C-alpha cells in the first residue's frame, strides 16, 4: 500500500534525523561545557544545543506513535508531556535562532556597542526570558492535548472542545499565535538581520570569502523551508472539512519530518567554526 510504505519511509527518516540530532547536539553540549571559554556566543550555542537535544530525546515518543498506525499506547499524561516538550523545544530553538541572528547583526552594525555592552550576564538573562516565553507559548499543549479512542483506534489529539464555537475559537487563537510568534516574526527578524549583514558586508567589503554569504542564505532558506510546511498545514487545519483528509494525513507527517530535520541540522549550521578544529586537534 502506498500510504503504509510512505509512513514506513517517514518513520525511518524520523529515526535517522533523531539519531543525528542526539549525536550532534550532544557533541555541542560537551564542547560548550568544557572546551571553549564561556563567552556571550557560547551561551547562545549551549542553550540552542540543549533545546534541540531535549527535542530529539523526547522525539522517539512521537516516532513510536508513528511506528504504529498512529495508535497511542501511552495515555493522557504522556500526551501532555510528550507534546508540550516537543513544542517547548521547537519554540525555544526558534527564539534562540532569532536572538543569534540579532546578536550577529549587532556585532556588525554596532561593533563598538557590541564591544562595550555584550556580556555573558545579559546573554543569560536573554536566554532565561526565551525559555519563559517558549513555555508561555507552548502551555496550550498541556491543556488540550487529550486522547480519544474511536472505533477501537486510540490516538492522541488536540482536543479544543474539552471533552463547537468556543472550541473553534480556542483552536484558532492557539494555532494563529503559534504561527505568528513562531514562524512569521522570527523569519522576518532572521531575514532582516542576515540581510542587513549582507548589505553591510557589501558596502564595506569585508567578506573576502564566499562562505559567509552561503551560510547566511542557507540559514534563511532552511528556516523557511523547514518551518513553513508545518505551520501552514496547521494553519489550514482550522476548517479541515473543506479539504480532503489526504491533505492532512499525508502532509503533516512530511512537514513533521522536515521540521525535525531542521532541529537536528542547525548544530552543524551554527557550531562549525574553530570548535570543530579544536575537536580535530583532540
Amino acid at each position: 500500500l502506498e500510504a503504509r510504505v510512505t509512513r514506513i519511509f517517514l518513520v525511518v527518516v524520523y529515526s535517522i534525523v533523531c539519531f543525528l540530532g542526539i549525536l550532534g547536539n550532544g557533541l555541542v553540549i560537551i564542547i560548550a561545557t568544557f572546551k571553549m571559554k564561556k563567552t556571550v556566543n557560547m551561551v547562545w550555542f549551549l542553550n540552542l544545543a540543549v533545546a534541540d537535544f531535549l527535542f530529539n530525546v523526547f522525539l522517539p515518543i512521537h516516532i513510536t506513535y508513528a511506528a504504529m498506525d498512529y495508535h497511542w499506547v501511552f495515555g493522557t499524561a504522556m500526551c501532555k508531556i510528550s507534546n508540550f516538550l516537543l513544542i517547548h523545544n521547537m519554540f525555544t530553538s526558534v527564539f534562540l535562532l532569532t536572538i543569534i541572528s540579532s546578536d550577529r547583526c549587532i556585532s556588525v552594525l554596532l561593533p563598538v556597542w557590541s564591544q562595550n555592552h555584550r556580556s555573558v550576564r545579559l546573554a543569560y538573562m536573554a536566554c532565561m526570558v526565551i525559555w519563559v516565553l517558549a513555555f508561555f507559548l507552548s502551555s496550550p499543549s498541556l491543556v488540550f492535548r487529550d486522547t480519544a479512542n474511536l472505533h477501537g483506534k486510540i490516538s492522541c489529539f488536540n482536543n479544543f472542545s474539552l471533552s463547537d464555537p468556543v472550541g473553534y475559537s480556542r483552536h484558532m487563537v492557539v494555532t494563529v499565535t503559534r504561527f505568528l510568534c513562531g514562524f512569521l516574526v522570527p523569519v522576518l527578524i532572521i531575514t532582516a538581520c542576515y540581510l542587513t549583514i549582507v548589505c553591510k558586508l557589501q558596502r564595506n567589503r569585508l567578506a573576502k570569502t564566499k562562505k559567509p554569504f552561503k551560510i547566511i542564505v542557507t540559514i534563511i532558506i532552511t528556516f523557511f523551508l523547514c518551518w513553513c510546511p508545518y505551520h501552514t498545514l496547521n494553519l489550514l487545519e482550522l476548517h479541515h472539512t473543506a479539504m480532503p483528509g489526504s491533505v492532512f494525513s499525508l502532509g503533516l507527517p512530511l512537514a513533521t519530518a522536515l521540521a525535525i530535520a531542521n532541529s537536528c541540522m542547525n548544530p552543524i549550521l551554527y557550531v562549525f567554526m574553530g570548535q570543530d578544529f579544536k575537536k580535530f586537534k583532540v
Binding site: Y70, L150, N158, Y230, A255
Partner: peptide, 9 residues
C-alpha cells in the same frame, strides 16, 4: 479528523 493529531500540536 479530530484536530491536532498527525503532528506535535
Amino acid at each position: 479528523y479530530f484536530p491536532g493529531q498527525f503532528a506535535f500540536s
